[PDB]
Write a protein that binds this ligand. Structure first.
Ligand SMILES: [Cl-]
Ligand SMILES: [Cl-]
Ligand SMILES: [Mg+2]
Ligand SMILES: [Mg+2]
Lengths: 146, 150, 157, 144, 144, 144, 157
RNA sequence: AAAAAAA
RNA sequence: AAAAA
RNA sequence: AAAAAAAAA
RNA sequence: AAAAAAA
RNA sequence: AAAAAA
RNA sequence: UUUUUUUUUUU
RNA sequence: UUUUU
RNA sequence: UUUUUUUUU
RNA sequence: UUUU
RNA sequence: AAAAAAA
RNA sequence: UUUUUUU
RNA sequence: AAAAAA
RNA sequence: AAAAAAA
RNA sequence: AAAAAA
């Protein structure tokens, strides 16, 4: 073990259980385009792509969403970003907002989904609404692909 | 061995007794964020009515017990200057003459400052009242007020 | 024992004169040994295309590593060397490359301040630490900045 | 101990392998000239004189050298070893000199775990330099 | 341990140095005439055969010397070393003799910390005296 | 404590020294051209602006350097230091770069005790290289 | 006590400047002191005859012991400096000599290898450690080799 | 368990 | 001391 | 994981 | 124990 | 466990 | 790395 | 856990 | 400690 | 938490 | 080293 | 570390 | 117990 | 505890 | 509690 320098025999037993398409817990980074004064609905379909090795999945259980302002804010302003979680059983009305204390620095915020509200979502569904004075917002979402 | 049980999967029955004491419109401790417009060299009185709003779920209240006030500069300062902000607490029994000032050591960084109201001065304030005066070289200031709505 | 040949080594660890070394048989020597190094050099990237970092950049007279023809890379760290495009924050991606098979990871770091560099690195496992000659590549660098700084921890042999 | 045969209560047919591996130290000689390096081939390890004519690959761990013949007149024996690798040859020259003219010169080097891959007969182990006409080599390897 | 690449959460750019120092033990030989001292030049340390040709100065810490060739007939090998300094040469003759005619003669001297300054190629390390025509040197020094 | 003068029962006359040594941390700036090294003169330490114009020699212990002006457009500030010695200049380029374009770049090097000798005004401390036109220096040294 | 004259002796054992020494009365001095030494020199012997080693060989500019006229010998060690005759192994004999009375011992060492030196020594007791001038002899050396190396441990005064 | 905050 | 995986 | 093989350098 | 994952 | 050394 | 209130099983 | 004195 | 044979949880 |  | 276990 | 049956 | 020295 | 004061 | 510094 860890000191061997050649191949060694494994005394395997019966054929085991198998699963060629298991689950995967991931953190998916991507960006969205946002306009001023309007809220953008983040689609779940942005997670199922070949760029994330997840084009083979058709459902996902989201756990937490984190957002950063990807582009600079308007002139004389500080960056901010808001998040309103969305659920098929009932959308929420929260506005988890974080503002940058430096014009040159991003504005970050996030929210964690409780265990009772951690069901599956499909590409047609939406995660949350994003609001910002910046034009582009980078998102990092922790979730469990299944 | 047999004593593992706090994860329920089905509905359980609640053996309730007499009718309890209820209150459909209780109090609420909050941290209300909002912004105000500020002019150069001119002090702006922050109205308490800014706290009662549907944008804060507080439009149903008519009075509030303010505990502490914090302020951040919301826009950039003038050219060559660092951001600053001042606060002067106001009270219906007698306004204060303190100017708690917090400046910015970085021109690109907000200027922050705040004050805490003592227990002896934590009374209700209606919308017509004012919380404090705000002075800043920036044209807009952001506030976060820890208050108890009732 | 015996008596003295006066080499005045005062208090052992504090002599001010040359002292005789009682040498013995000729030892094992190596005029060209190995050298574990952290080599700082810059590579240039275009906005939207990848750039393969040649291993030959490590061997140079600017690094004293000019007598080597092979090197074992341990870990690669990257920093954006130039400012990002307007309105944008800095970012840098690293995709490890190996002769036995290129990888597909994109270890990315993004600067939260437009004036600050974006940094990210990756460590090569022990089972993949073989030699790489000048004709080989280390990794693929992507960035919105025109130049990326690299500090490669490696062993020259 | 015993004096007669005993019964073994065997069970299922175990995992077998008619051609296993073998960790060895292979002693063989090479011819070296003055001022020129000799690339020791890995094919020298595979031979019927070492019970390794059935192996096609091997994993070298450490290499040791000894001057097999007397040095030139007025000189002391020395021997150099430059490790060679398919992913990239080295430039080290691990050298050992003899302090007595009538005594061998000994030197050796160890291959790290990260460089211990298989080498076929076409490959080379190391370059051997010596002022002596022959060098004795004892190579600790793992035949597979 | 790990079998794949792992991310390194790097931070700010660190302090770098592409041309660092190097502590070495340089082996080289010199020719020695009978009854004559040879001033070992410092420039012998700077060479592409030692990977040190990129340096221009070096801090010598200790010097060791062996006889590289056989002594004259009926004699035992000997070797002497006289430390040389730009601020003032010494007059010590650290001598070492062999107890077997077939064996080398070895001797050395350590430089005190107060006398460990830089030396350039034009400078000399020490004077060497021997009945043998060549002397093997191993100098522990600090390239900078 | 005491509120008035108190007598000092002095004895014999003591050993005096009107011109003693002084350990300092001298701050001064130098101009640096792009792509060119600047030999920092030792004489910059001897000045009435540092109270050290009464000295003629100084023992440098450590050297630290910051970028005093802003870098060129789109670049991050950097600074290099090459230690210089009369007994032999070095080839190290202790470089430090900034991670923020608006922030200085800092780097330094410590001189070993064996290389801590006196230097006069004509001598040079180190070579400095930077993309900025000025470099702020703080040199820990011993005036004597 | 009082206040300071600033001699910056950093951490006591690590000052980088000259520091004042508070000297007092003039001490006891000796411009020509003693010197305990181990003097290496060679003497030549013939096969079958003895050779008296003069004490004057110790005083020389080659040993820095040129200003001395007397010396106290403590111990004598000998080594054959040249090869032995053919078929023979090396041997060396030492017979101590003293002014108060020569001795008759023959402390002999023989080399078990024809290529190796033959070594032997003798220590002089404290009751016999007086001074010997250049006109005196140390010991008688016998050997089959033509030259014998001597390392004499002594005190020069 | 859920609402200021704190290095 | 009882149940239902 | 019995022997053969580098060594805690 | 290795890799992916939250402060 | 690199390269130097009471 | 340390709290005020809406309900809230259990020691 | 779930259902029972 | 490692490579192959045998023991024992 | 997913694997044999 | 021989019978019925070896936990 | 269980033990009990003829050389 | 030689010759130098917080 | 500060200053003046005896060995 | 001055001025320098793993
Ligand atoms: Cl011949
Ligand atoms: Cl069940
Ligand atoms: Mg950048
Ligand atoms: Mg002899």
């Amino acid at each position: 073990g860890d000191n061997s320098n050649v191949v060694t025999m494994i005394r395997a037993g019966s054929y085991p259980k198998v699963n060629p398409t298991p689950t995967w817990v991931r953190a998916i980074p991507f960006e969205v385009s946002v306009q001023s004064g309007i809220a953008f609905k983040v689609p779940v379909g942005s997670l199922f792509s070949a760029n994330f090795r997840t084009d083979s999945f058709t459902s996902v259980t989201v756990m937490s969403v984190r957002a950063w302002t990807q582009l600079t804010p308007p002139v004389n302003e500080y960056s901010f970003v808001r998040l309103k979680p969305l659920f098929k059983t009932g959308d929420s009305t929260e506005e988890f907002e974080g503002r940058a204390s430096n014009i040159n620095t991003r504005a970050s915020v996030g929210y964690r989904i409780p265990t009772n509200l951690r069901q599956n979502t499909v590409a047609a569904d939406n995660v949350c609404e994003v609001r910002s004075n910046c034009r582009q917002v980078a998102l990092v979402i922790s979730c469990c692909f299944n």
